[PDB]
Amino acid sequence: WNGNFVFDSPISKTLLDQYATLPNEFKFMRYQAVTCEPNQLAEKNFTVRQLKYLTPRETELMLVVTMYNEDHILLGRTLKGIMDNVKYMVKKKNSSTWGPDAWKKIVVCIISDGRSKINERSLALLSSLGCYQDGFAKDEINEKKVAMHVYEHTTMINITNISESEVSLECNQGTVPIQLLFCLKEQNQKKINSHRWAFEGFAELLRPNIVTLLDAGTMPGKDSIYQLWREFRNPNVGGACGEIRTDLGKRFVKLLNPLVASQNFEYKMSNILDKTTESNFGFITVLPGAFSAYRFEAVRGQPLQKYFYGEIMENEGFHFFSSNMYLAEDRILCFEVVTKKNCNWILKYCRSSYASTDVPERVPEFILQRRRWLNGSFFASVYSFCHFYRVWSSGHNIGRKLLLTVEFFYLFFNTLISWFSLSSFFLVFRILTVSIALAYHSAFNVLSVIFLWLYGICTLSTFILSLGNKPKSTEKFYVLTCVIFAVMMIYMIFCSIFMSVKSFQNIDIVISLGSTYCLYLISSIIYLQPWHMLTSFIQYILLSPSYINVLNIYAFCNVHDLSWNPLGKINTTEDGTFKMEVLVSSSEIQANYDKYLKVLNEPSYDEKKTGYYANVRSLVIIFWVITNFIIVAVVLETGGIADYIAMKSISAEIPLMTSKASIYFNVILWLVALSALIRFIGCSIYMIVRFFKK
Amino acid sequence: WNGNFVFDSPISKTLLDQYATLPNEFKFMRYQAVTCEPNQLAEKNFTVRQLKYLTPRETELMLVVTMYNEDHILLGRTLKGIMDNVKYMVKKKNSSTWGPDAWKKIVVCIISDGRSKINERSLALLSSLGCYQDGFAKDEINEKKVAMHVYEHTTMINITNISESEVSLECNQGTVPIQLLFCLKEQNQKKINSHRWAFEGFAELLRPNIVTLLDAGTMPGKDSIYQLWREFRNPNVGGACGEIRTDLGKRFVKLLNPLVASQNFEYKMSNILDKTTESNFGFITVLPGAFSAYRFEAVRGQPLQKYFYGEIMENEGFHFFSSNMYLAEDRILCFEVVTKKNCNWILKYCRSSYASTDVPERVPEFILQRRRWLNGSFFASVYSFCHFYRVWSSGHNIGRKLLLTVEFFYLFFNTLISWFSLSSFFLVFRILTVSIALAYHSAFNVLSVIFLWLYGICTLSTFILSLGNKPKSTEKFYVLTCVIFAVMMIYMIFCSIFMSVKSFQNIDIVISLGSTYCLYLISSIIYLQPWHMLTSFIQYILLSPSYINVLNIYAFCNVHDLSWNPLGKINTTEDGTFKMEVLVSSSEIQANYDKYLKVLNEPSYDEKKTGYYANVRSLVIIFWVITNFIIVAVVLETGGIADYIAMKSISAEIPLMTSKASIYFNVILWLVALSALIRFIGCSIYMIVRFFKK
Ligand SMILES: CC(=O)N[C@H]1[C@@H](OP(=O)(O)OP(=O)(O)OC[C@H]2O[C@@H](n3ccc(=O)[nH]c3=O)[C@H](O)[C@@H]2O)O[C@H](CO)[C@@H](O)[C@@H]1O
Ligand SMILES: CC(=O)N[C@H]1[C@@H](OP(=O)(O)OP(=O)(O)OC[C@H]2O[C@@H](n3ccc(=O)[nH]c3=O)[C@H](O)[C@@H]2O)O[C@H](CO)[C@@H](O)[C@@H]1O
Ligand SMILES: [Mg+2]
Ligand SMILES: [Mg+2]
Incomplete structure (x- = not known):
């Protein structure tokens, strides 16, 4: 179809049985072999079901969930949060946007990275939902390696209870359909490439208003996604985030651990003090686990370009912000959205929206997790302070430029204090x-x-x-x-x-x-x-x-992770002379000697970058x-x-x-x-x- | 032949032309595909030409030349030094062991670590000598990987001049035949495995009296090997070594470098003081580049066994000396030979025998070279001091046991001084x-x-x-x-x-x-x-x-070097329906769902050693x-x-x-x-x- 591999194989009779408890999209599960680059989805004649109906579906919110290739429990937690939010947004009464058919304006995108790393439990659960089934995955087509597999289904089942060991899936008159879209990369590329697929790929086809980034294991509240969406009513808002809570388990059992209580207090102090103080000025840095949203038109262009590829101007040699800029590439989005030329986007912090994540409980993984936070915060602060003159080239008014300059100075002052601790x-x-x-x-x-x-x-x-x-x-x-x-x-x-x-x-x-x-x-x-x-x-x-x-x-x-002609086979069971009298010459005996007598007559880019x-x-x-x-x-x-x-x-x-x-x-x-x-x-x-x- | 691959392909007409300037061994070059372990050469029915003539040849001296990168010029100098000594020994008249046919009692074994790593210039030089020629190397036989290739020739040509860029090869009435034996491993195993092939392999077939260890690039003197051989007249001597000289180049040009003069003085101080004094007590160790010789019956048994494999008594876990024995593995032979049970072998230092080697001239390679010397000397001293009670279980007399105890104490005293420097x-x-x-x-x-x-x-x-x-x-x-x-x-x-x-x-x-x-x-x-x-x-x-x-x-x-389902290749150019009507069942659609629903119903030894x-x-x-x-x-x-x-x-x-x-x-x-x-x-x-x- 159109030069790309596709397939519409009806979901399991069992699944289809409950779904009816029928329009076309509920009944088939579509597969697609994406063999191009993320920045070529539209020109390659690749599309998604949202764009094929009689009336194309204008999406309002794209929820990108990055599969952790981990236990189904975490992913089920995230999916249950999302489905609860969608149910809340479809039951809303006095609203111009959300309504009984808002299930049509929300797309869930699950960008799993490890085709082999993915947990079997996750595929088993995803299969239960009907957005995946094994058997038709071509690892090669037209002598070209397929980059990722896209499965698209609109399931009518929801997770309603998640005990310590099970997820309760039911299909009643109260469940709402959800438009799943399971992306599945085949080789371990890092999270920035998942974001590249999310932003330069499917977001270019769907054209959402807001793009929300989640992780596997982050549970949004019953009402968090809607409260984050409401922050974008102000046309000046270009991004937003919410509170992060450490979840303490059954009746706060995890507080007995002294390494969990410390992180509980640290998170809640951070949210109370630093996020509000920054949000007053107008520039915030989304916390590592904090769920975030970006207005699509805001990040589109220079911010995304320098988030994904870095500073283009660079010779063959390396540079601090041309070979080490990636260290803050993430927070670069916030730095680039606020200081966009001729544009007055601001970043806002929403406290009415929260999400409870799980924190490390042993010292080794705690240290390994904080190793990425500290380096990121240090490099981001250094870069933002070094490039504060960009604030005066943007489109803000004079007062907001002054406020941003003051905030940048204060942030570097805090970084300077933390350097001498x-x-x-x-x-x-x-x-x-x-x-x-x-x-x-x-x-x-x-x-x-x-x-x-x-x-x-x-x-x-x-x-x-x-x-x-x-x-x-x-x-x-x-x-x-x-x-x-x-x-x-x-x-x-x-x-x-x-x-x-x-x-x-x-x-x-x-x-x-x-x-x-x-x-x-x-x-x-x-x-x-x-x-x-x-x-x-x-x-x-x-x-x-x-x-x-x-x-x-x-x-x-541990700033960077530094990772520093055969021939001849003879075997005759009968001891037969396969060569026999063949391969017997007298002139060749002189040729090798003459050639041998005639003889007696910087490493690659990777090692350089390392x-x-x-x-x-x-x-x-x-x-x-x-x-x-x-x-x-x-x-x-x-x-x-x-x-x-x-x-x-x-x-x-x-x-x-x-x-x-x-x-x-x-x-x-x-x-x-x-x-x-x-x-x-x-x-x-x-x-x-x-x-x-x- | 006897179940092993062999071949006797006459040497180049050119080579054969000068050799005549004829008995059988001068005229054919023999190849052999060794597919067994080094400790199995005799039982596998593998032999060497020395054992096939009408009267078997009893070898008196076996010279081992280790080559890895097999750089040329260095190998040329090593071969020229051996050739000069052999010709001098054949010229010797008043000698029972040596005389007009002394060359027949000496065998030269050249072992290359990796055919891929060997320098083409060297192999070409070897071809000029006639002990190698390309074309018949079977990388697999009887569905079994050949472990190394053995080429055997008795060349009549000698190197007579080595300028900065050429080696002068001539065949006159004054040249002497030399019994080359070119071993060539196929994969990069370390030097200890080369010694394992030399000692547990070909030395078991040849049965030499003395086994001399050389390294490519080291030049023995005009008379050094004979003077080292004369040290074994005393039946109590179980090993020996000689002086090491830094060669200074053409009219001492290299003395202008201040990193070469330092090593010159250090080497000559070491030879004058530490070797002579150690030789007096006995148990005289060998320098890293110093040419060494071991009486075969002396090292045979426990010394070789614990040099190659280490302490056998060991559970699944790790022990300090057992695991780190490799640090003092080479200096285990000297410690083992001296302290052999019921045997009174001593180690002697010969000053009449010297060899001029080339020293590093830049700081990086100097540091990298000394990194192996310092660790080896430290671990060897620690082990020898910890196991000094073995001196009193050997066969020496009381005075020699007391002298060895005193020497061990003094050596650990020197190590203790060097630890606090x-x-x-x-x-x-x-x-x-x-x-x-x-x-x-x-x-x-x-x-x-x-x-x-x-x-x-x-x-x-x-x-x-x-x-x-x-x-x-x-x-x-x-x-x-x-x-x-x-x-x-x-x-x-x-x-x-x-x-x-x-x-x-x-x-x-x-x-x-x-x-x-x-x-x-x-x-x-x-x-x-x-x-x-x-x-x-x-x-x-x-x-x-x-x-x-x-x-x-x-x-x-840097004590140790710590190194921490493809399918569906559907590419139909004519858009052919390979599956077509086939692969369209409906029962399978339920099978995957049922199985998926049912699912939703310490690393390896290397990382541990690292x-x-x-x-x-x-x-x-x-x-x-x-x-x-x-x-x-x-x-x-x-x-x-x-x-x-x-x-x-x-x-x-x-x-x-x-x-x-x-x-x-x-x-x-x-x-x-x-x-x-x-x-x-x-x-x-x-x-x-x-x-x-x-
Ligand atoms: C080096 C390291 O050990 N990192 C630690 C740390 O980092 P940290 O928590 O920063 O990083 P995460 O691995 O949790 O990454 C967050 C998001 O990235 C996805 N994603 C995608 C691709 C990829 O290469 N990596 C990746 O993480 C993740 O599932 C998740 O969706 O967090 C956890 C500690 O509690 C542990 O899991 C890890 O020990
Ligand atoms: C890690 C390292 O850089 N080692 C350095 C050092 O060690 P060092 O001089 O101790 O070691 P060498 O590599 O010279 O080894 C001596 C003998 O071993 C043979 N052989 C065989 C197999 C094998 O794996 N290794 C091996 O060395 C060698 O050619 C030679 O026959 O010496 C030289 C400095 O002047 C350099 O070449 C090297 O930079
Ligand atoms: Mg996580
Ligand atoms: Mg060398």
Whole structure:
């Protein structure tokens, strides 16, 4: 058909039996062998059923779900969320867009990447829905490798219950049809290629209004997708995101794990403070698991082009934003949408839309997950700060350009703070432990020495294992390191409290620690989600030194993933002379000798790119360590500086502590207080504006 | 023939033309397809021509030449050296073993690691000799992969001149026949497998008296092989080696390179001191490039068995020595032969036999070469010290057992010194630079701070690049680091000389530095090779800090090399319906659905061994760094110890320097003087004994 392989094989008699409990699209399942590039779907005469009926279907919302090639449970969770949202949107009464036939304006796209990696349970479930069936998959046509397989069905069944082991599929008068579209790549290309298929491929044929990106295992709420869609009423909005919640399992059983409570508090703090503060200015960065939506006309053009391919202008050699730009290629979309030329798109954060995802529960996978977040956030901030002049070439008004400039400066200020945390934590810890020892003398001298040595044995080992080993290989040591750092944090808290109490008895750390805690709590109260402030808060404080001295070290030590004529067969069962008298010459005997006597008379692009990536990774690490030690040696007078000053004075001996320690200790808490104040003000403005608009 | 593939195809008419300038073996070149394991050559009915004549040939000396890339010129020099020695031995008149037919008692075996890797120029050279010709190589026989190809010829031509670009081959009345035997493995197995073929394979058929190991590119002297053979007159000798000389090129042009003069001095010091002294005690090890010889009956049995396969007693898990035995596998033979049960074999060092090899001239390949020497020497010393009790289970007399015990203790003492060199160098450097600054105040304060920072920026970078990067990628930085370390060594020498001169003017470092230099020079004079003591000595002193702070770091950071349903090709040009009406059942439509609904109703040994190796590498590194810093912090009172002592005294402030620095500084030079004295006495005893015996 039209030069492409197609097939319409009716779904199982069983499925068809319940579907009737009939128009044409419910009854056949269509297959399509896509053998072109994603950016060629329209010109290759490839189409989708939405475009073939008597009246073509104008789609309003395209839900792209990236199959995790994982257990059906996660995918079933995502699909159940989507079907619940669609049912809500078809039961809506007073609405111009959604109605009893909105099931026709929504398309679900499941871009599975591993044709072999895909879990059998997923295909088994997808088959139950009727959007897949085995048997007709041509791995080669016209002597050309088919790039992916497209199966299209409109199933009338919905998942209504998902226990710990089963998904309940039923077909009643209350179920709604859903337009599935199962894409299935055949070879392991990364997530950016899945997005390339979603955006440059099927979105070019369907022409949606909004394009929503989901993952496998992310459950949207009963009402989340509709609330995210409502954000695009304002014609200026070019993107949006929602809240991310850690799901705690049956009656919050997972809170007993101390690595899940930490992430619960971290997620809810992030959503309450950072997302609202950024959304006030107008530029936000979708969280890794946060469900996102992009108005199609907004991302179309330059944003997509530099998200997929990167900076085109590049010679044969490599460049920081021409060979390393991909590091922030994702957040590039947000950076490119906001700063589009002659266009005033803004990014908005929706709090009425949430999605509950599952968080890692062991330290190895936690470290491996955060390795991609930290590198992405660091490179994205560097790039956005370096290219802030683009804000003044866009189409915004003067006030919105000024606001965006201020936000970019503040974001780079936060990045600069996070870069020096390695030295800041050690400086605070050492100054505090030596000050209390020097003031009270009781047993804190030996504790100071012991804790200095414990930190050094855990920092050195973390560097070495992150540079050479893998987290899965050594999990017990990482658990031990986290426990040791938690004990050090307990001791630091004890020193601060104890000296503050004694100073109160005798008559700033107490002043700030209370201010930032109260700002946190007041923001939580205003956001109307205050239970995290006590339920899962302590574990965040104890596993906070391990977020500054383990996740950062591994993230920086693993910036890029660097992966560095036969003939002659004789076998005669009867020992027969197959060659016999043949292949027997006297002139050839001289030919080989003459030829042999006559003889006696940079590697590929991959290794070059790998070398460049390794050099970048080892230059970043070295600069990080050197600058942090520069700060430490300037403050504590380590590195032989105190020796040098003593020698100049002789031209004496080293004192125990100086006023530089006090000055630095005050500066750090002032910075912390300023950051907390800024984020509190941002959250307050967000809630006030939202309330007035509502 | 006998169930194995053979072929006797006369050599080129050209070759045969000069050979006559005729008995049977000169005129045919025999091929053999070896399809068995090395330890099965005799039982498989595989033989070599030496065993087929009317009277079998009892071989007296078997020479093994290992070739991998099989570069030409290098192989040409190796063959020319062997040819010269054989012709000299045949010329020898007053000898029972050697005479006009001495060549028949010597067999030359050339084993190539990979036919794909062998250099075409070499194979061509081999063809010129007539021991190889292309065309009849069966990569498969009897449905079994042939393990290696054996070509056997007895050529009458010799190489008589090797210019920089040509090898001069002539056939006169003065040339001697040589019994070549070209082994050619087909896939890249390592050098230990080449030795397994040499020892468990063809040596089992030939039954030689002495087995000599050479490496392509190494040139034995005009008389070296005979002088090495003469060492086995003493029935107690079980092995032997000779001197290694760096060849300096045409009129010593290569001495202008400062990385070649350093290795020249290092090699000649090693041969003069360490070999002679070790030879005195016995159990004299062999240098990596040093040509070696083993009496066949000596190595046969337990030594070979534990050299090739390692410790047999082992469960499914890993053990340290068993798994890491390969690190000391080559230096297992020497340890095994000496300590053989009920046998009194000794190892002797022959100075009358030498061989000139080529040394690396760039820093990357120099580091990569020394990475295998340092690891081998470290593991061999550890194993030999751990298993010294085996000396008292052998057959030696009481005095020789005592001597071997003493030698093992002294060798581990040297290894223990070499383990702490990282801290020793820094301690000496820092104490010296702070002492001169503290005494004279002029400009040495800033120099002390500058040099402390330069060392730390070059040590940190060396660790990071050795752990993450590769030497070839960053050569300029390694050159810069070596230059910086040479400048630091110049400054240390200046400080020592300057303070010693001022102290002489006012009235131990001078005392020792002169004693060790004089012992070096007197040993060189007694060994009668004194030109190195001035020609290539200074460059060794300047590139000595880079041998302690670059080669060691890279060697320890790279202990082990850790390398972590197609169907439906439907392409009908005429749009032919291959399935057509067929493949249109309806019962199958239900079968897949039912099966799919029913579904919805540790890695391999390699990764485990790799994980173990990485863990061993990262535990060794950590222990090395920790112990060296323990020494440094105890001496200099770093690591917060001085702070702790000051706090106890308060229960004051840190002084600049203590008496621990003086005590340590004296202890180090005492150790150096003791080592120099021991090696001088050993060399003197060696020369005196050799002179009296001669
Ligand atoms: C290197 C690594 O170990 N990554 C970890 C991390 O990354 P992290 O969670 O960032 O990444 P994910 O693998 O979860 O990727 C998110 C989306 O990408 C799809 N998709 C598609 C193609 C592809 O190559 N990769 C891919 O991830 C995923 O199923 C999902 O749809 O998260 C999890 C920890 O809880 C673990 O699964 C992993 O240990
Ligand atoms: C990892 C590495 O880079 N090794 C370096 C080093 O090791 P090094 O000199 O120790 O090792 P060599 O490669 O020279 O080995 C010696 C003998 O082994 C043969 N043989 C056989 C099989 C095999 O796998 N390997 C093998 O070496 C060799 O040709 C020779 O006959 O020496 C040289 C430096 O001047 C360089 O060639 C190399 O850069
Ligand atoms: Mg997931
Ligand atoms: Mg070589």
